[PDB]
């Protein structure tokens, strides 16, 4: 609403923020928590974990 060219499409965050994101679903659903899965959170190898 401040640009009108489109809604945010990326997040950059601390590891802790990511640990949460990486370990929960994003899907609209009942609930879900586990170990990080799809998101590669190891900064040793990447900087890019995945897409929420």
């Amino acid at each position: 609403r401040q640009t009108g060219r489109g809604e945010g499409n990326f997040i950059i965050a601390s590891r802790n923020v990511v640990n949460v994101l990486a370990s929960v679903d994003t899907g609209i659903s009942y609930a879900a928590q586990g170990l990080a899965t799809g998101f590669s959170t190891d900064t040793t190898k990447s900087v890019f974990a995945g897409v929420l």
């Binding site: 899965t37 799809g38 590669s40 040793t44 190898k45 990447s46 890019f48 974990a49 995945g50």
Partner: protein
């Protein structure tokens, strides 16, 4: 994923799906024989997101480019020596024979194939 390889990526994906659907399980050693050097990957059950692959390729390329570099340069230097280059020359001459009013290696469909119509098209493409 660089766009220059888009259709090739799709071809590989299709081949992978067939492998995934097969019974080639109970493998104590990866079923490779020669050529390419392997690498043990994260294997998140089966997953390797492209971004995981990106580091994976760096970590495959570093420990050994030097070896390749030394061997190739060595071979090229050997190739510039007296009576070495000649070995290659004679090998090349016989391996690739090409003369006046003569053919080149060409497709020879002398065994059963789907159809002569296709055989002719295959030959033209081979050319």
């Amino acid at each position: 994923v660089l766009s220059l390889f888009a259709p090739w990526a799709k071809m590989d994906e299709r081949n992978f799906k067939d492998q995934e659907k097969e019974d080639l399980v109970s493998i104590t050693a990866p079923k490779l024989d020669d050529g390419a050097r392997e690498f043990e990957v994260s294997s998140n059950e089966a997953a390797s997101p492209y971004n995981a692959a990106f580091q994976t390729i760096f970590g495959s390329y570093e420990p050994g480019m030097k070896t390749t570099r030394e061997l190739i340069d060595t071979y090229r230097n050997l190739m510039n020596n007296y009576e070495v280059d000649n070995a290659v020359s004679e090998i090349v001459s016989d391996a690739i024979v090409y003369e006046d009013d003569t053919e080149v290696v060409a497709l020879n469909l002398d065994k059963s194939k789907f159809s002569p119509k296709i055989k002719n098209m295959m030959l033209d493409e081979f050319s």
